[PDB]
Design a binder for this molecule. Structure first.
Ligand SMILES: *[C@@H]1O[C@H](CO)[C@@H](O[C@@H]2O[C@H](CO)[C@@H](O[C@@H]3O[C@H](CO[C@H]4O[C@H](CO)[C@@H](O)[C@H](O)[C@@H]4O)[C@@H](O)[C@H](O[C@H]4O[C@H](CO)[C@@H](O)[C@H](O)[C@@H]4O[C@H]4O[C@H](CO)[C@@H](O)[C@H](O)[C@@H]4O)[C@@H]3O)[C@H](O)[C@H]2NC(C)=O)[C@H](O)[C@H]1NC(C)=O
Ligand code: NAG
Lengths: 105, 105
């Protein structure tokens, strides 16, 4: 309904079933992208040139071409204590877990 | 309406109203991503760990959190001859123009 932005989402690992292997943390502030990517896209929309092109194409062909979508543009990692694929409990940074910024792609 | 994948698209510059500033090309093959991040039986959804976390959360709470989006994972550049600030034909390499591949983000 509204323009593309990041929304807050706590994820409990025991709800998703990741607590079989994740010892810490019990969950995390993963956040989620939502909102519209409508013409004209501003600097804050973190758009790609293709998202700007697709924006115009959808205006004239809304039946066949979708608008660009609101997806994470910057993801960060979280440090977690977990069971390895070698049966070892390790403290490693687990990539692409947290939304830092949203954008139109 | 269908499973996340890259689709073809030819963008004609006169149709988008850009024939005035882009001296060449007249258009190009931009492609677009479309489809639901449904994780089908005989397909490989390229997905970040966030998009996997968001999928799990969506399946357990569909009314609260939307599914991750079918966004471009790889984009490529195209070169264009455009009209300068001072009205002169200039060759510039336009980044993030062509969709090379799609995935769930
Ligand atoms: C288009 O894209 C941009 C770029 O991503 C985006 O704007 C970005 O907004 C985000 C927040 O939405 C900004 O993120 C914050 O930035 C600071 C920067 O910190 C510097 O200093 C320290 C110390 O060395 C370092 O951590 C860092 O390396 C920097 O040099 C961070 O301090 C913020 O961290 C907090 O939030 C994180 C998650 O985002 C947590 O992981 C973290 O532990 C921090 O928690 C604090 O705030 C939380 C709320 O976010 C809260 O949960 C806690 O209670 C706590 O108080 C954070 O990373 C980012 O830098 C912006 N970047 C720019 C370039 O402006 C735009 O929003 C986007 N467009 C759209 C449409 O979304
Ligand atoms: C997903 O896409 C990126 C960039 O196109 C690539 O580096 C990576 O190897 C891909 N992952 C899988 C599992 O196909």
């Amino acid at each position: 309904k509204s323009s593309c932005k990041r929304h807050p989402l706590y994820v409990d690992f025991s709800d998703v079933g990741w607590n079989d292997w994740i010892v810490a943390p019990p969950g995390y502030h993963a956040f989620y992208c939502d909102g519209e990517c409508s013409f004209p896209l501003n600097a804050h929309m973190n758009a790609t040139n293709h998202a700007i092109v697709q924006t115009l194409v959808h205006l004239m062909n809304p039946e066949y071409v979708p608008k660009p979508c609101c997806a994470p543009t910057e993801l960060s990692a979280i440090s977690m204590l977990y069971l390895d694929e070698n049966e070892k409990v390790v403290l490693k940074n687990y990539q692409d877990m947290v939304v830092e910024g949203c954008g139109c792609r």
